Amino acid sequence: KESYYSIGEVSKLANVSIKALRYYDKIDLFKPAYVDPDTSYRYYTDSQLIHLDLIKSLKYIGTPLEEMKKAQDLEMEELFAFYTEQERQIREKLDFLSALEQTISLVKKRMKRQMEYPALGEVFVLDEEEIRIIQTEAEGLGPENVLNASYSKLKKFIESADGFTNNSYGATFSFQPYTSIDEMTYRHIFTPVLTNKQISSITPDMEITTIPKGRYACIAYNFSPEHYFLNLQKLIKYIADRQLTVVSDVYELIIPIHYSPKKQEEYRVEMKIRIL
Amino acid sequence: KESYYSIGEVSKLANVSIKALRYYDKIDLFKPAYVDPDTSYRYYTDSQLIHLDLIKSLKYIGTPLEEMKKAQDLEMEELFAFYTEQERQIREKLDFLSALEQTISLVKKRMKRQMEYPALGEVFVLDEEEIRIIQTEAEGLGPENVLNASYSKLKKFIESADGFTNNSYGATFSFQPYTSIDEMTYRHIFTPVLTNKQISSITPDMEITTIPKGRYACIAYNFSPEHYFLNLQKLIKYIADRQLTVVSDVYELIIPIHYSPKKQEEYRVEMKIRIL
DNA sequence: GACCCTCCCCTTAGGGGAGGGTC
DNA sequence: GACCCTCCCCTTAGGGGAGGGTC
Ligand SMILES: COc1ccc(C[C@H](N)C(=O)N[C@H]2[C@@H](O)[C@H](n3cnc4c(N(C)C)ncnc43)O[C@@H]2CO)cc1
Ligand SMILES: COc1ccc(C[C@H](N)C(=O)N[C@H]2[C@@H](O)[C@H](n3cnc4c(N(C)C)ncnc43)O[C@@H]2CO)cc1
């Protein structure tokens, strides 16, 4: 009333740290009514305390300080609108988070499917849900010369729309009595798509399609070069043996087991193909 | 394949800024396979490119870099769990935002009611919805000696639970044939409560109650000292004139018109009282 | 003994840009 | 001509703490 609060007294009173008050002073956001000209001590009036209501509420909303100065000024009608602004900045973040949560939940669903493989290196025929994908012509690439850079573009499209990177790298090819890896080419390469955020500015050299619901002969294993062809060969036999009728390319997918560079590179591979 | 990508080549390929790559190198998060010992030029292999999938996905989730190093290591089963962690950190933020949005939307509703006052300095009798509040005994305070610091405690309780600060400061008192402000004391002071976040560790010297749904004689005006008592007096007359029967304390509330300290302090005041 | 001062140094994740030396 | 290097300086909102001088 007829004396000043000292910075401590205010901080205790306002639930705002002493160092915060100095900062708000420094940046001319909230400043001592008085400053002792000899002790540099900061003194505060009871009535000026009200300005903190705004500063604190805003801070809690996460409005940045420089923005708060602009806000101090407005009278209610104008400050109402400011609030709407935050409200719409907040609906934005939520939308982005709900999206994010749904994505993770899917990435986790795809991951579970992996560690719940029925067995490795053995051929299992299973009933599968469809996996939306985007893909591009493999332009004379096969298993032998295909690089990560090959996927630069697909990834760039899925990143813009999903913000997550495909954990996994796919290619497809013709099911054929292959006698040598030497003699395979990929028809397409591709990656799976996770969200249904309409993908911006997609180009006519990318096709969006899916690996369709249906019965599949799969085999999966942890990659090493020797095994690659031989597992494929196993599949081929599996189908021939059962006189089974194939109805798609062979799809393959490659997933890293880890991303550490302190450990040896390791991948899970899975090969599948649709059958009647 | 049999040569290196240069930092530019990678950045273009990976949609990750050149300066970012240098940073990830600096902090041993992602590091050139090779560094030319004479040009300090950073060279990268096509296969190491995969580690970026994780870095980028994570970054997008907003996982902090130092955390990413820990994450690189885990094999799927362990990294699954990491994801759950984020998922639960995200459900947290949403909960906090939905809460935040609902609060703002209320603060805005209270604000509209203000600028849609029927008129100022005139007594209007209106049908009101209830306002939950928390309050404390005014310990011999009246209009003359009441300070902001008086509300230190209420505010501290509502801040912990709402995170917003009451825009408005309330007191109540006995409706009485007052002939002088000199002769009033507040029964309680109080502030309105916004959220229904259970308020932690509330103490027995605070009562939670509401200003109840009902018919009210109100007057509201922009404060100045002369007007304060005289408006009160008007209310008193209003009731006497209509032979109206009061059924509560007089409630008053004070709201700032602005929070700028570049402008003169200004408050809206409103006084009301419940009637049959 | 307690409180307040000023003035270091520190933290995230790079972007901008200057002032080289390389492809 | 283009690309890459290292090494300034900069940004949010203070917290920690040292090394005073004040209540
Ligand atoms: C690992 O990062 C990649 C690299 C390339 C791809 C593209 C493709 N899906 C694909 O077929 N990716 C797989 C493999 O086909 C291919 N690969 C690399 N080396 C060989 C090889 N020898 C060296 C004898 N024989 C057969 N395949 C080979 O590399 C990938 C596993 O490293 C996917 C992931
Ligand atoms: C503004 O910040 C405050 C300060 C105190 C309060 C407490 C209380 N609700 C209350 O009655 N707050 C109101 C007013 O009652 C009181 N007030 C301040 N000065 C006077 C006065 N004279 C100086 C003659 N006469 C009557 N009332 C006065 O200050 C507040 C408006 O400034 C609320 C807001």
mmCIF file of all heavy atoms in Angstrom, chain A residues 107-140, unseen atoms left out:
data_model
loop_
_atom_site.group_PDB
_atom_site.id
_atom_site.type_symbol
_atom_site.label_atom_id
_atom_site.label_comp_id
_atom_site.label_asym_id
_atom_site.label_seq_id
_atom_site.Cartn_x
_atom_site.Cartn_y
_atom_site.Cartn_z
ATOM 1 N N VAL A 107 2.985 -47.891 -36.736
ATOM 2 C CA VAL A 107 4.387 -48.343 -36.818
ATOM 3 C C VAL A 107 4.628 -49.483 -35.840
ATOM 4 O O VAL A 107 5.378 -50.430 -36.137
ATOM 5 C CB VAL A 107 5.394 -47.245 -36.466
ATOM 6 C CG1 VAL A 107 6.806 -47.770 -36.648
ATOM 7 C CG2 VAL A 107 5.174 -46.044 -37.320
ATOM 8 N N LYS A 108 3.987 -49.371 -34.674
ATOM 9 C CA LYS A 108 4.078 -50.370 -33.618
ATOM 10 C C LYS A 108 3.355 -51.645 -34.011
ATOM 11 O O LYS A 108 3.869 -52.721 -33.750
ATOM 12 C CB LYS A 108 3.553 -49.806 -32.289
ATOM 13 C CG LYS A 108 4.627 -49.156 -31.382
ATOM 14 C CD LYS A 108 4.023 -48.696 -30.030
ATOM 15 C CE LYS A 108 3.279 -49.841 -29.296
ATOM 16 N NZ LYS A 108 2.878 -49.526 -27.908
ATOM 17 N N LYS A 109 2.192 -51.519 -34.660
ATOM 18 C CA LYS A 109 1.447 -52.687 -35.177
ATOM 19 C C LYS A 109 2.251 -53.497 -36.203
ATOM 20 O O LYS A 109 2.180 -54.735 -36.192
ATOM 21 C CB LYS A 109 0.070 -52.307 -35.735
ATOM 22 N N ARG A 110 3.026 -52.795 -37.055
ATOM 23 C CA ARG A 110 3.848 -53.401 -38.146
ATOM 24 C C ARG A 110 5.059 -54.133 -37.583
ATOM 25 O O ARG A 110 5.389 -55.247 -38.008
ATOM 26 C CB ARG A 110 4.310 -52.334 -39.154
ATOM 27 C CG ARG A 110 3.347 -52.124 -40.323
ATOM 28 C CD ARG A 110 3.981 -51.292 -41.454
ATOM 29 N NE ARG A 110 3.029 -50.446 -42.191
ATOM 30 C CZ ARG A 110 1.933 -50.891 -42.802
ATOM 31 N NH1 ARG A 110 1.621 -52.172 -42.745
ATOM 32 N NH2 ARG A 110 1.144 -50.051 -43.459
ATOM 33 N N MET A 111 5.700 -53.461 -36.629
ATOM 34 C CA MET A 111 6.717 -53.996 -35.725
ATOM 35 C C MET A 111 6.342 -55.273 -34.937
ATOM 36 O O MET A 111 7.152 -56.208 -34.883
ATOM 37 C CB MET A 111 7.076 -52.892 -34.730
ATOM 38 C CG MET A 111 8.552 -52.650 -34.520
ATOM 39 S SD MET A 111 8.863 -50.994 -33.855
ATOM 40 C CE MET A 111 10.270 -50.496 -34.915
ATOM 41 N N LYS A 112 5.159 -55.302 -34.294
ATOM 42 C CA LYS A 112 4.675 -56.525 -33.611
ATOM 43 C C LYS A 112 4.607 -57.669 -34.624
ATOM 44 O O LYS A 112 5.204 -58.729 -34.409
ATOM 45 C CB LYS A 112 3.331 -56.348 -32.873
ATOM 46 N N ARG A 113 3.930 -57.445 -35.748
ATOM 47 C CA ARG A 113 3.832 -58.460 -36.784
ATOM 48 C C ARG A 113 5.194 -59.099 -37.069
ATOM 49 O O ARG A 113 5.279 -60.300 -37.322
ATOM 50 C CB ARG A 113 3.257 -57.856 -38.057
ATOM 51 C CG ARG A 113 3.095 -58.861 -39.180
ATOM 52 C CD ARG A 113 3.518 -58.261 -40.509
ATOM 53 N NE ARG A 113 3.146 -59.130 -41.620
ATOM 54 C CZ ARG A 113 3.814 -60.222 -41.974
ATOM 55 N NH1 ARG A 113 4.900 -60.585 -41.306
ATOM 56 N NH2 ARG A 113 3.397 -60.952 -42.998
ATOM 57 N N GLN A 114 6.246 -58.287 -37.004
ATOM 58 C CA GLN A 114 7.620 -58.741 -37.226
ATOM 59 C C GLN A 114 8.155 -59.699 -36.186
ATOM 60 O O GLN A 114 8.764 -60.697 -36.534
ATOM 61 C CB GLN A 114 8.582 -57.557 -37.262
ATOM 62 C CG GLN A 114 8.130 -56.403 -38.117
ATOM 63 C CD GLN A 114 8.314 -56.669 -39.593
ATOM 64 O OE1 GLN A 114 8.636 -57.797 -40.006
ATOM 65 N NE2 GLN A 114 8.110 -55.632 -40.405
ATOM 66 N N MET A 115 8.000 -59.363 -34.911
ATOM 67 C CA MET A 115 8.618 -60.155 -33.856
ATOM 68 C C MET A 115 7.737 -61.341 -33.507
ATOM 69 O O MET A 115 8.141 -62.220 -32.744
ATOM 70 C CB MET A 115 8.890 -59.287 -32.639
ATOM 71 C CG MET A 115 9.527 -57.962 -33.000
ATOM 72 S SD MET A 115 9.434 -56.718 -31.701
ATOM 73 C CE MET A 115 7.680 -56.378 -31.640
ATOM 74 N N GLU A 116 6.543 -61.360 -34.104
ATOM 75 C CA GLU A 116 5.613 -62.492 -34.020
ATOM 76 C C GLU A 116 5.576 -63.256 -35.340
ATOM 77 O O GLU A 116 4.547 -63.840 -35.665
ATOM 78 C CB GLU A 116 4.183 -61.998 -33.761
ATOM 79 C CG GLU A 116 3.675 -62.209 -32.325
ATOM 80 C CD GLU A 116 2.424 -61.382 -31.988
ATOM 81 O OE1 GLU A 116 2.095 -60.432 -32.744
ATOM 82 O OE2 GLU A 116 1.763 -61.680 -30.964
ATOM 83 N N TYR A 117 6.680 -63.225 -36.100
ATOM 84 C CA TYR A 117 6.919 -64.147 -37.236
ATOM 85 C C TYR A 117 6.668 -65.572 -36.725
ATOM 86 O O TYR A 117 7.062 -65.905 -35.597
ATOM 87 C CB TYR A 117 8.401 -64.031 -37.641
ATOM 88 C CG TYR A 117 9.394 -64.244 -36.468
ATOM 89 C CD1 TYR A 117 9.549 -65.507 -35.850
ATOM 90 C CD2 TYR A 117 10.170 -63.175 -35.967
ATOM 91 C CE1 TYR A 117 10.440 -65.690 -34.775
ATOM 92 C CE2 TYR A 117 11.066 -63.348 -34.901
ATOM 93 C CZ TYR A 117 11.193 -64.603 -34.320
ATOM 94 O OH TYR A 117 12.068 -64.760 -33.274
ATOM 95 N N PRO A 118 6.012 -66.419 -37.544
ATOM 96 C CA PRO A 118 5.809 -67.835 -37.160
ATOM 97 C C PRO A 118 7.111 -68.649 -37.090
ATOM 98 O O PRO A 118 7.264 -69.461 -36.187
ATOM 99 C CB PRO A 118 4.854 -68.383 -38.235
ATOM 100 C CG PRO A 118 4.910 -67.401 -39.362
ATOM 101 C CD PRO A 118 5.288 -66.057 -38.776
ATOM 102 N N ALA A 119 8.027 -68.431 -38.033
ATOM 103 C CA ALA A 119 9.391 -68.968 -37.968
ATOM 104 C C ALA A 119 10.212 -68.417 -39.123
ATOM 105 O O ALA A 119 9.653 -67.909 -40.101
ATOM 106 C CB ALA A 119 9.398 -70.485 -38.002
ATOM 107 N N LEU A 120 11.537 -68.538 -39.009
ATOM 108 C CA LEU A 120 12.464 -67.918 -39.957
ATOM 109 C C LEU A 120 13.071 -68.937 -40.896
ATOM 110 O O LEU A 120 13.341 -70.052 -40.500
ATOM 111 C CB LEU A 120 13.573 -67.161 -39.220
ATOM 112 C CG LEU A 120 13.124 -65.889 -38.497
ATOM 113 C CD1 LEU A 120 14.282 -65.267 -37.695
ATOM 114 C CD2 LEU A 120 12.500 -64.889 -39.484
ATOM 115 N N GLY A 121 13.270 -68.553 -42.145
ATOM 116 C CA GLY A 121 13.822 -69.466 -43.110
ATOM 117 C C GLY A 121 12.871 -70.577 -43.519
ATOM 118 O O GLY A 121 13.223 -71.378 -44.368
ATOM 119 N N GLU A 122 11.681 -70.653 -42.925
ATOM 120 C CA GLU A 122 10.679 -71.639 -43.350
ATOM 121 C C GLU A 122 9.544 -70.912 -44.036
ATOM 122 O O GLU A 122 9.234 -69.780 -43.669
ATOM 123 C CB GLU A 122 10.139 -72.463 -42.176
ATOM 124 C CG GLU A 122 11.164 -73.405 -41.533
ATOM 125 C CD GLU A 122 10.502 -74.539 -40.721
ATOM 126 O OE1 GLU A 122 9.284 -74.798 -40.951
ATOM 127 O OE2 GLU A 122 11.197 -75.177 -39.874
ATOM 128 N N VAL A 123 8.933 -71.568 -45.028
ATOM 129 C CA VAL A 123 7.805 -71.008 -45.792
ATOM 130 C C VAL A 123 6.429 -71.259 -45.153
ATOM 131 O O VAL A 123 6.038 -72.403 -44.902
ATOM 132 C CB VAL A 123 7.779 -71.542 -47.207
ATOM 133 C CG1 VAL A 123 6.580 -71.012 -47.937
ATOM 134 C CG2 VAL A 123 9.029 -71.147 -47.930
ATOM 135 N N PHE A 124 5.710 -70.174 -44.890
ATOM 136 C CA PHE A 124 4.467 -70.204 -44.141
ATOM 137 C C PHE A 124 3.486 -69.544 -45.077
ATOM 138 O O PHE A 124 3.821 -68.547 -45.679
ATOM 139 C CB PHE A 124 4.616 -69.367 -42.863
ATOM 140 N N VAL A 125 2.293 -70.092 -45.242
ATOM 141 C CA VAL A 125 1.281 -69.441 -46.078
ATOM 142 C C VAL A 125 0.253 -68.724 -45.230
ATOM 143 O O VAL A 125 -0.494 -69.382 -44.513
ATOM 144 C CB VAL A 125 0.483 -70.470 -46.836
ATOM 145 C CG1 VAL A 125 -0.748 -69.822 -47.478
ATOM 146 C CG2 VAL A 125 1.361 -71.152 -47.841
ATOM 147 N N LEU A 126 0.152 -67.402 -45.323
ATOM 148 C CA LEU A 126 -0.753 -66.721 -44.405
ATOM 149 C C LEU A 126 -1.727 -65.707 -45.008
ATOM 150 O O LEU A 126 -1.513 -65.222 -46.124
ATOM 151 C CB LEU A 126 0.002 -66.169 -43.199
ATOM 152 C CG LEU A 126 1.283 -65.439 -43.563
ATOM 153 C CD1 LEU A 126 0.926 -64.041 -44.045
ATOM 154 C CD2 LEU A 126 2.253 -65.404 -42.379
ATOM 155 N N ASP A 127 -2.815 -65.448 -44.269
ATOM 156 C CA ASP A 127 -3.894 -64.557 -44.686
ATOM 157 C C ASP A 127 -3.574 -63.141 -44.213
ATOM 158 O O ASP A 127 -3.483 -62.892 -43.020
ATOM 159 C CB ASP A 127 -5.229 -65.045 -44.123
ATOM 160 C CG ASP A 127 -5.802 -66.258 -44.896
ATOM 161 O OD1 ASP A 127 -5.307 -66.592 -45.994
ATOM 162 O OD2 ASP A 127 -6.775 -66.887 -44.412
ATOM 163 N N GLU A 128 -3.380 -62.225 -45.161
ATOM 164 C CA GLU A 128 -2.762 -60.924 -44.899
ATOM 165 C C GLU A 128 -3.727 -59.764 -45.127
ATOM 166 O O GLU A 128 -4.576 -59.846 -46.005
ATOM 167 C CB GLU A 128 -1.580 -60.762 -45.830
ATOM 168 C CG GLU A 128 -0.341 -61.495 -45.384
ATOM 169 C CD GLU A 128 0.512 -60.667 -44.435
ATOM 170 O OE1 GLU A 128 0.132 -60.513 -43.242
ATOM 171 O OE2 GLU A 128 1.572 -60.174 -44.894
ATOM 172 N N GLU A 129 -3.612 -58.688 -44.344
ATOM 173 C CA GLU A 129 -4.347 -57.459 -44.661
ATOM 174 C C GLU A 129 -3.514 -56.616 -45.656
ATOM 175 O O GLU A 129 -2.297 -56.819 -45.792
ATOM 176 C CB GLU A 129 -4.704 -56.666 -43.391
ATOM 177 C CG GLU A 129 -5.582 -57.401 -42.363
ATOM 178 C CD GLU A 129 -7.055 -57.538 -42.779
ATOM 179 O OE1 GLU A 129 -7.356 -58.285 -43.730
ATOM 180 O OE2 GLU A 129 -7.932 -56.919 -42.139
ATOM 181 N N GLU A 130 -4.150 -55.695 -46.373
ATOM 182 C CA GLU A 130 -3.448 -55.030 -47.466
ATOM 183 C C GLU A 130 -2.535 -53.952 -46.931
ATOM 184 O O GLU A 130 -2.820 -53.338 -45.908
ATOM 185 C CB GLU A 130 -4.417 -54.394 -48.444
ATOM 186 C CG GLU A 130 -4.890 -53.043 -47.975
ATOM 187 C CD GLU A 130 -5.585 -52.238 -49.046
ATOM 188 O OE1 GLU A 130 -6.085 -52.841 -50.026
ATOM 189 O OE2 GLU A 130 -5.635 -50.993 -48.888
ATOM 190 N N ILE A 131 -1.440 -53.708 -47.640
ATOM 191 C CA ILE A 131 -0.510 -52.680 -47.236
ATOM 192 C C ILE A 131 -0.458 -51.634 -48.340
ATOM 193 O O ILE A 131 0.097 -51.894 -49.392
ATOM 194 C CB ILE A 131 0.920 -53.262 -47.044
ATOM 195 C CG1 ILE A 131 0.905 -54.717 -46.514
ATOM 196 C CG2 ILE A 131 1.795 -52.307 -46.231
ATOM 197 C CD1 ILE A 131 0.616 -54.903 -45.007
ATOM 198 N N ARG A 132 -1.037 -50.457 -48.112
ATOM 199 C CA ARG A 132 -0.945 -49.377 -49.095
ATOM 200 C C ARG A 132 0.505 -49.079 -49.333
ATOM 201 O O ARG A 132 1.304 -49.109 -48.399
ATOM 202 C CB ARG A 132 -1.630 -48.107 -48.609
ATOM 203 C CG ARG A 132 -3.104 -48.107 -48.836
ATOM 204 C CD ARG A 132 -3.506 -46.851 -49.583
ATOM 205 N NE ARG A 132 -3.154 -45.647 -48.840
ATOM 206 C CZ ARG A 132 -3.704 -45.297 -47.675
ATOM 207 N NH1 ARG A 132 -4.627 -46.067 -47.090
ATOM 208 N NH2 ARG A 132 -3.315 -44.177 -47.077
ATOM 209 N N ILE A 133 0.858 -48.795 -50.570
ATOM 210 C CA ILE A 133 2.237 -48.456 -50.862
ATOM 211 C C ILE A 133 2.316 -47.439 -51.957
ATOM 212 O O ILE A 133 1.347 -47.202 -52.696
ATOM 213 C CB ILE A 133 3.026 -49.650 -51.339
ATOM 214 C CG1 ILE A 133 2.406 -50.188 -52.624
ATOM 215 C CG2 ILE A 133 3.028 -50.707 -50.288
ATOM 216 C CD1 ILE A 133 3.382 -50.887 -53.534
ATOM 217 N N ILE A 134 3.493 -46.859 -52.095
ATOM 218 C CA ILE A 134 3.774 -46.101 -53.288
ATOM 219 C C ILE A 134 4.997 -46.682 -53.946
ATOM 220 O O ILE A 134 5.919 -47.099 -53.251
ATOM 221 C CB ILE A 134 4.064 -44.665 -52.969
ATOM 222 C CG1 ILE A 134 4.757 -44.053 -54.181
ATOM 223 C CG2 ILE A 134 4.988 -44.586 -51.754
ATOM 224 C CD1 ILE A 134 4.560 -42.563 -54.323
ATOM 225 N N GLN A 135 5.031 -46.675 -55.268
ATOM 226 C CA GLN A 135 6.096 -47.344 -55.964
ATOM 227 C C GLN A 135 6.444 -46.696 -57.288
ATOM 228 O O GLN A 135 5.692 -45.899 -57.821
ATOM 229 C CB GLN A 135 5.670 -48.769 -56.212
ATOM 230 C CG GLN A 135 4.471 -48.815 -57.069
ATOM 231 C CD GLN A 135 4.250 -50.180 -57.653
ATOM 232 O OE1 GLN A 135 4.784 -51.200 -56.966
ATOM 233 N NE2 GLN A 135 3.609 -50.328 -58.713
ATOM 234 N N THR A 136 7.568 -47.096 -57.850
ATOM 235 C CA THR A 136 8.150 -46.437 -59.011
ATOM 236 C C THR A 136 8.854 -47.505 -59.837
ATOM 237 O O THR A 136 9.216 -48.536 -59.302
ATOM 238 C CB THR A 136 9.169 -45.331 -58.589
ATOM 239 O OG1 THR A 136 9.645 -44.659 -59.752
ATOM 240 C CG2 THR A 136 10.383 -45.913 -57.836
ATOM 241 N N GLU A 137 9.047 -47.297 -61.131
ATOM 242 C CA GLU A 137 9.644 -48.363 -61.910
ATOM 243 C C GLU A 137 11.085 -48.509 -61.565
ATOM 244 O O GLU A 137 11.787 -47.538 -61.427
ATOM 245 C CB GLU A 137 9.510 -48.139 -63.386
ATOM 246 C CG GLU A 137 8.202 -48.577 -63.853
ATOM 247 C CD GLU A 137 7.894 -47.995 -65.212
ATOM 248 O OE1 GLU A 137 8.887 -47.669 -65.923
ATOM 249 O OE2 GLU A 137 6.680 -47.858 -65.572
ATOM 250 N N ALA A 138 11.523 -49.746 -61.460
ATOM 251 C CA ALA A 138 12.833 -50.018 -61.000
ATOM 252 C C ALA A 138 13.879 -49.836 -62.095
ATOM 253 O O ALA A 138 15.046 -50.130 -61.890
ATOM 254 C CB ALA A 138 12.894 -51.402 -60.377
ATOM 255 N N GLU A 139 13.493 -49.324 -63.251
ATOM 256 C CA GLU A 139 14.494 -48.798 -64.193
ATOM 257 C C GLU A 139 15.776 -49.664 -64.353
ATOM 258 O O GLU A 139 16.884 -49.137 -64.403
ATOM 259 C CB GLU A 139 14.857 -47.351 -63.809
ATOM 260 N N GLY A 140 15.614 -50.985 -64.445
ATOM 261 C CA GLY A 140 16.744 -51.903 -64.608
ATOM 262 C C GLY A 140 17.561 -52.057 -63.331
ATOM 263 O O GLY A 140 18.784 -52.180 -63.339
#
